[PDB]
Amino acid sequence: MDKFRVQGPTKLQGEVTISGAKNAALPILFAALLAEEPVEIQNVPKLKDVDTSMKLLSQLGAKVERNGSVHIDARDVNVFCAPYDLVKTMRASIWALGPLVARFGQGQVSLPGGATIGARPVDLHISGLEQLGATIKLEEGYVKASVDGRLKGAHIVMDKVSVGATVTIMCAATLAEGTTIIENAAREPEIVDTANFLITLGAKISGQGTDRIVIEGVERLGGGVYRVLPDRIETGTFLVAAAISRGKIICRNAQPDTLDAVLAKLRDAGADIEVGEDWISLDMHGKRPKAVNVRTAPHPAFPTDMQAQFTLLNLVAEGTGFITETVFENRFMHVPELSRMGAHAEIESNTVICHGVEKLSGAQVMATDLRASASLVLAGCIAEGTTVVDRIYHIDRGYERIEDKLRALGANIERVKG
Amino acid sequence: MDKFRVQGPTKLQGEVTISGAKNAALPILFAALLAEEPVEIQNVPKLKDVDTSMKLLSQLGAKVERNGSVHIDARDVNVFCAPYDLVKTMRASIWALGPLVARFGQGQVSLPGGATIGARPVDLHISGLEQLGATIKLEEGYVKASVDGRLKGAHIVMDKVSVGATVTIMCAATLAEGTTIIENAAREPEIVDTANFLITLGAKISGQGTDRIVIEGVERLGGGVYRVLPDRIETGTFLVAAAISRGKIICRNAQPDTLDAVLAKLRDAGADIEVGEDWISLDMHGKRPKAVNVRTAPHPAFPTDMQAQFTLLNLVAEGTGFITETVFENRFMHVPELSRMGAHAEIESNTVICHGVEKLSGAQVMATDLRASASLVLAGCIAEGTTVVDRIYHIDRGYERIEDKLRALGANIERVKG
Amino acid sequence: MDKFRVQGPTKLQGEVTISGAKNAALPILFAALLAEEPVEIQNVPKLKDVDTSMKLLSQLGAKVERNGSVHIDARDVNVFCAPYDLVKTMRASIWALGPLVARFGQGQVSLPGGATIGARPVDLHISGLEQLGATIKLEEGYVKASVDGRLKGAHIVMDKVSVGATVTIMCAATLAEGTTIIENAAREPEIVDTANFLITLGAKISGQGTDRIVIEGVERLGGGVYRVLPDRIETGTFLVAAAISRGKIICRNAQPDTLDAVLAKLRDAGADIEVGEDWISLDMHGKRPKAVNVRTAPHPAFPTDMQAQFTLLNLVAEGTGFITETVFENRFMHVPELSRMGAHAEIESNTVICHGVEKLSGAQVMATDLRASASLVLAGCIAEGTTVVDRIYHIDRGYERIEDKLRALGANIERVKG
Numbered sequence A, B, C: 001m002d003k004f005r006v007q008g009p010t011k012l013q014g015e016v017t018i019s020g021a022k023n024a025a026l027p028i029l030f031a032a033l034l035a036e037e038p039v040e041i042q043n044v045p046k047l048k049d050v051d052t053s054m055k056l057l058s059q060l061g062a063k064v065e066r067n068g069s070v071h072i073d074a075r076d077v078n079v080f081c082a083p084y085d086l087v088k089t090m091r092a093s094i095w096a097l098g099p100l101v102a103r104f105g106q107g108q109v110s111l112p113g114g115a116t117i118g119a120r121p122v123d124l125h126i127s128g129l130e131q132l133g134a135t136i137k138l139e140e141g142y143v144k145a146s147v148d149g150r151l152k153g154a155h156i157v158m159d160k161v162s163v164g165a166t167v168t169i170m171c172a173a174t175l176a177e178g179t180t181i182i183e184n185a186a187r188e189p190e191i192v193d194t195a196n197f198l199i200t201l202g203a204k205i206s207g208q209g210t211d212r213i214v215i216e217g218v219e220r221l222g223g224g225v226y227r228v229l230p231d232r233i234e235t236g237t238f239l240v241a242a243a244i245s246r247g248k249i250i251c252r253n254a255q256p257d258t259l260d261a262v263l264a265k266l267r268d269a270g271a272d273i274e275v276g277e278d279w280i281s282l283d284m285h286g287k288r289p290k291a292v293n294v295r296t297a298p299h300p301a302f303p304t305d306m307q308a309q310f311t312l313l314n315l316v317a318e319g320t321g322f323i324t325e326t327v328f329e330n331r332f333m334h335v336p337e338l339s340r341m342g343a344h345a346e347i348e349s350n351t352v353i354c355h356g357v358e359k360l361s362g363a364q365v366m367a368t369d370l371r372a373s374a375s376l377v378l379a380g381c382i383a384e385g386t387t388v389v390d391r392i393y394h395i396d397r398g399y400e401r402i403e404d405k406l407r408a409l410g411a412n413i414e415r416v417k418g
């Protein structure tokens, strides 16, 4: 079980180049199941899940290779069932379903198994596919969908915001008969990005970014070349790495406009943030962050996927910060691991109350999830002494080359056998 | 987003007239779907959800108007599907289902969407309707029920106490073939009230209030005139408004016997309670409440729907109070909002441990649910300075005219734009 | 409602003879539904649930009697539906399902109702039965399974570790056509034991204890005589009874090898543990335990079913102990009840942080579950003064004769009317 062994204190300062979004990359690799001429996707990070996804794409019979870009030729997809052995490692394989139903009239994906940050149902995928025509059955740990003939576009009001369900309905609606409207669409950048990929392939979508997306179905999608947006949560992570460590950094290959709410928040912890077109810099000027108060919620508010990292920021800032998590209901499993390093947090229902201390002591902690694991590694950069983060594999799902990137900022990290 | 801006400290004292029960009114409006001569329901409060319910009743083709009473002529109901656009605002629209199945042989209600105080499944509705004959399917975010011919009464043991499931089976059983027995029936006053409405219409029900209700089916229900009981949780709320503020008040238009367990509890916080037939008074005599210990559970024990308000009472009483919530599993979202106003609570599993402070400071808080929102407004009446309760819309679902009623007791409240 | 009234402090020291495992006994009584010559099961404890199970076995038409052993003749089973009235008291009746499907081609068990320590779905039973052939439907609060003809063995990878699902698939696979492989099988001793019972009856199973069990189906199972292993959680409980009370004890009729991880942990709280072949002794030598740190997880790690008892140990040990529960998600309901007796615990997500105090004061507490209830009784043995444990019925489900066994160690316990 690889662990990280980190020694602090250390001061994260320097520059980092930012990778493609994990969470754009993943939807778009599955969306390519609809494409009927070859596809090049540039700026794909190298993450555990991209690698599992590419394996599945080729178990369904697409021709796939990569490097800085992934290349997918999906013309001869012939299997329509994903094997459990690729699918259990990643929740993201539920997005093969809609592509296979829209374009092949069936699909069978396992029900994603292993929660961590909540129950995480896919009932809003199933529902929307159904509303567009499909017949879903659930049996033997699988979601079997099928439709005879094409789907029929529908007017789909989504009950709650869901980035992923929005993706499934958006993708599946591109090969449907007619016009789909998704009200209360998730507004996130990866949803926009994804829709723009679809549109390169020749989909007819408008109003992504907005709360109401519109797709009129076509009969066939082509191919083409799409570059993936920069990863705003890897970005937010490296901006927190330097605020909590009283440093300063520049983020290269970034998109500032996908981060407005973190940047304000970091303005509020006391940070000196500047931005240009494809870069952001933060300067703490030697100072310690000030406690902020956060509520997560969907884009464009403060992203849940930065909550664990702002948790640590607050627990070494000046003051009391409260952070309410509202999007997911078991996303404080980093807290007690941070407490073993010294921190002072009370949880009360969905809020973690946070009393900033000046320094944390290095400890042996456990990764419970992706963003927890990054948090715990940043925490040990700054702690006193030695942190060992057990189960560092989780970090590998969303931070390409991170020991290298944090060690370019001065960090002292080391990956240990097991 | 309307907020309340409250200034304290202030002393809630005076009198208040009590409204009809939200939670009797709601079941009875849906029960009227069975009535085949006109219905007058008197003492219906003016609550968000009554207004949504009346809109739906008339989208199914009943003739509906109101004022102090709601008037429903339900003879020409012809739609049997509730539209999502009325149904997503209110969980209470699941009670159209049983009326439409019993009397029309189908019905289609959306699955209620948006939790707050727990997961809140309706599996005990579905189960009992099924046991009485129906065929339920779940698809496209809907609960489709149907039966060919009448339902057949059954012997239905309910697995856990559920006020709402009890309602669905009780209503649906009135047009069934034969005799239904519900064991472990919910005993609440609104269940009794509801059954008595049904009985006015000519149902044949006995043993409501008891843990075993019996209904023998008839073929047709008529019409008539029913007045709704007084709202014991609006009542409990105004009795807490005055205990925590060291006041005194009289509740007009009340029913003492639906509150025995709160009244004892308030006797235990130190209150001087008197009661007559349709009124209750509490006198704190200038004094501060004493901490009590509560476990919620179904009627006739301490009602969950007073737990948030007794939370605040304890967090400004003398002493440590523990309150265990056992009925719903995400009903401490008022706690951290009360903590931002100064309070000292530890949560530990289902209990909130409560260390009474003498005064709370006014703050900016958020409503997370109905009874949370009332709690937060009472808390700012008593706090020092200014509270702003964001999302005050929630209060509107269960407290008719409340800014007026609390401002008649001296409160300084003001509704702000957004 | 019987309660226990306990007076401390008192010092639990002596010897105890250990009973058969509750959680081996239960699976094996249901597994006997497959046996087609008479079965004797020796060393069956006398627990509430064994008594409910025997009642059901004979409601399906087996011939059943007991004493130190239970005797089951299951040749003329003719009902295949379990009645709700036996089934709602026990989650363990879901294990009739697989036996009835494998051997009779149908079965109908109610969906288990009443949670306490989590949501506790049986989706991994259903899934595996399905994968082996069955057709499951869910309606009227029942799980109806059926297959026309035999089941067909399959290669079943289990998504998460589940002791019970492993049992259902293991049992049902013995009368199947061919070879079943269960990957990620639960490794627990009761699973091993159960498989060895099956094997006595003539099943063909190998690799229990391992993460991959293999069963090739036969056509008929016989009868025979199996003795049940010793109960390692009753064992762990009595070893904690004496560590927290600074005593010493000997466990007769034990199996040390099913407890390696508790024994180490108790070595770490400072205990002097010795073991022989069918016995374990612990000596605290007069001293108070030292705080340990626990994570639960499946066998062979630290068992969840000892977590509540190690909670109390830590909250009267020297130091801070952290205990993370990872197996079940509502298994800290003992904590606030222990807090009313004086303890200092913070919960933070899945961990209870534990600050050992030297003494607890006697109080009035409530049992919320099996292992909670034992914990609370051990806590009042050691507390100052009087504890009353309300709802002591829960203890009766897994600790045969416990007031007698703890009173043989010096305890002062008394069962009170209600």
Ligand SMILES: CC(=O)N[C@H]1[C@@H](OP(=O)(O)OP(=O)(O)OC[C@H]2O[C@@H](n3ccc(=O)[nH]c3=O)[C@H](O)[C@@H]2O)O[C@H](CO)[C@@H](O)[C@@H]1O[C@@](CF)(OP(=O)(O)O)C(=O)O
Residues within 6 Å of the ligand: A022, A023, A026, A091, A092, A118, A119, A120, A121, A122, A123, A124, A125, A160, A161, A162, A163, A164, A165, A304, A305, A327, A328, A329, A370, A371, A398
């Ligand atoms: C791959 C990917 O797009 N993941 C991101 C994506 O994942 P997801 O699609 O599940 O979010 P979603 O909006 O659908 O969930 C929102 C809320 O809706 C519920 N939900 C979601 C789908 C549904 O059918 N029903 C439903 O009830 C969730 O259980 C949650 O309570 O949106 C969320 C929320 O903003 C991120 O927080 C994820 O990022 C993470 C995990 F959150 O990635 P991952 O899936 O790998 O685990 C992350 O990087 O931290």
Ligand SMILES: CC(=O)N[C@H]1[C@@H](OP(=O)(O)OP(=O)(O)OC[C@H]2O[C@@H](n3ccc(=O)[nH]c3=O)[C@H](O)[C@@H]2O)O[C@H](CO)[C@@H](O)[C@@H]1O[C@@](CF)(OP(=O)(O)O)C(=O)O
Residues within 6 Å of the ligand: B022, B023, B026, B091, B092, B118, B119, B120, B121, B122, B123, B124, B125, B160, B161, B162, B163, B164, B165, B304, B305, B327, B328, B329, B370, B371, B398
């Ligand atoms: C309209 C109305 O009758 N609402 C009241 C009514 O609502 P409800 O019928 O859902 O209560 P119910 O007894 O059925 O729930 C009891 C417990 O049973 C579970 N439950 C309920 C139904 C079911 O099919 N399955 C099931 O598992 C719940 O999820 C809960 O954990 O009974 C509860 C409990 O005593 C009150 O606490 C509600 O009052 C509130 C909310 F609680 O109103 P609302 O629905 O508007 O939100 C309130 O005023 O505070």
Ligand SMILES: CC(=O)N[C@H]1[C@@H](OP(=O)(O)OP(=O)(O)OC[C@H]2O[C@@H](n3ccc(=O)[nH]c3=O)[C@H](O)[C@@H]2O)O[C@H](CO)[C@@H](O)[C@@H]1O[C@@](CF)(OP(=O)(O)O)C(=O)O
Residues within 6 Å of the ligand: C022, C023, C026, C091, C092, C118, C119, C120, C121, C122, C123, C124, C125, C160, C161, C162, C163, C164, C165, C304, C305, C327, C328, C329, C370, C371, C398
């Ligand atoms: C009878 C019996 O075998 N019970 C023991 C048995 O029970 P169970 O089979 O449900 O454990 P299981 O491994 O299947 O559950 C493990 C985890 O998996 C989930 N789970 C389980 C089954 C499933 O189909 N799906 C699923 O999601 C659970 O909800 C839990 O989160 O394994 C557990 C876990 O190690 C013990 O902790 C139980 O012991 C207790 C309760 F835990 O007995 P009981 O059932 O009487 O309540 C106990 O003595 O304390």
